[PDB]
Amino acid sequence: DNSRYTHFLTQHYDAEPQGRDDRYCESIMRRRGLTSPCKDINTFIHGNKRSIKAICENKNGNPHRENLRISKSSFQVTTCKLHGGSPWPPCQYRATAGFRNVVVACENGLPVHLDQSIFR
């Protein structure tokens, strides 16, 4: 029903990554279609979807700033950050795994945006 939500899963969700190293990032950024031009920073959330959607309501979120939500729980996450100078592929990424709460924006109970600022 929501294309922004399906698009959120594409850009910001990976259920079970295993190794969350540089090559993890370089591969998934490609697989998820984020390399023309290279997205300069992009973060993936791991685990189940229930926990993530739940950020859109009381169960696992609170209102945050100007129309954003912040999760109550902490998530396993991997931020991929471009390097090397060029905007165009091949896109080299450096991986940073993390564990903390995340900020998103929701519509109709579904996350449609990940605030990347906190992972910078």
Curated annotation (Swiss-Prot):
Outcome after substituting L34P: Homodimerization is similar to wild-type; causes mislocalization in the cytoplasm; strongly reduces ribonucleolytic activity
Main EC class the enzyme belongs to: hydrolase
Tissue distribution: Expressed predominantly in the liver. Also detected in endothelial cells and spinal cord neurons.
Localization: Secreted; Nucleus; Nucleus, Nucleolus; Cytoplasm, Stress granule
Any GO MF annotation of the entry: peptide binding
Effect of mutating Q11A: Slightly decreases binding affinity for RNH1
Keywords for the protein's UniProt record, in alphabetical order: Amyotrophic lateral sclerosis, Angiogenesis, Cytoplasm, Developmental protein, Differentiation, Disease variant, Disulfide bond, DNA-binding, Endonuclease, Hydrolase, Neurodegeneration, Nuclease, Nucleus, Protein synthesis inhibitor, Pyrrolidone carboxylic acid, Secreted, Signal, Stress response
Cystine pairs: C25-C80, C38-C91, C56-C106
Reported impact of K39I: In ALS9; reduced ribonucleolytic activity; low angiogenic activity; reduced mitogenic activity; moderate reduction of thermal stability
CC per GO annotation: actin cytoskeleton; angiogenin-PRI complex; basement membrane; chromosome; cytoplasm; cytoplasmic stress granule; cytosol; endocytic vesicle
Principal cellular location given in the protein's record: secreted
EC number of the protein: 3.1.27.-
Effect of H7A: Significantly decreases binding affinity for RNH1
Outcome following mutation: K39Q: Significantly decreases binding affinity for RNH1
Domain of life: Eukaryota
Residues forming the catalytic site: H12, H113
Residues that coordinate or bind tRNA: R20, D21, C80, V102
Regulation: Has weak tRNA ribonuclease activity by itself due to partial autoinhibition by its C-terminus (residues 140-147), which folds into a short alpha-helix that partially occludes the substrate-binding site. In absence of stress, the ribonuclease activity is inhibited by RNH1 in the cytoplasm. In response to stress, dissociates from RNH1 in the cytoplasm and associates with cytoplasmic ribosomes with vacant A-sites: ribosomes directly activate the tRNA ribonuclease activity of ANG by refolding the C-terminal alpha-helix.
Recorded consequence of changing H113R: In ALS9; uncertain significance
Impact upon substituting V102I: In ALS9; uncertain significance
Effect upon mutating T79S: In ALS9; uncertain significance
Disease: Amyotrophic lateral sclerosis 9: A neurodegenerative disorder affecting upper motor neurons in the brain and lower motor neurons in the brain stem and spinal cord, resulting in fatal paralysis. Sensory abnormalities are absent. The pathologic hallmarks of the disease include pallor of the corticospinal tract due to loss of motor neurons, presence of ubiquitin-positive inclusions within surviving motor neurons, and deposition of pathologic aggregates. The etiology of amyotrophic lateral sclerosis is likely to be multifactorial, involving both genetic and environmental factors.
Family designation: Belongs to the pancreatic ribonuclease family.
Subunit structure as annotated in this protein's UniProt entry: Homodimer. Interacts with RNH1; inhibiting ANG ribonuclease activity. Interacts with PCNA.
Protein name: Angiogenin
Residue window of the full protein shown: 26 to 145 of 147
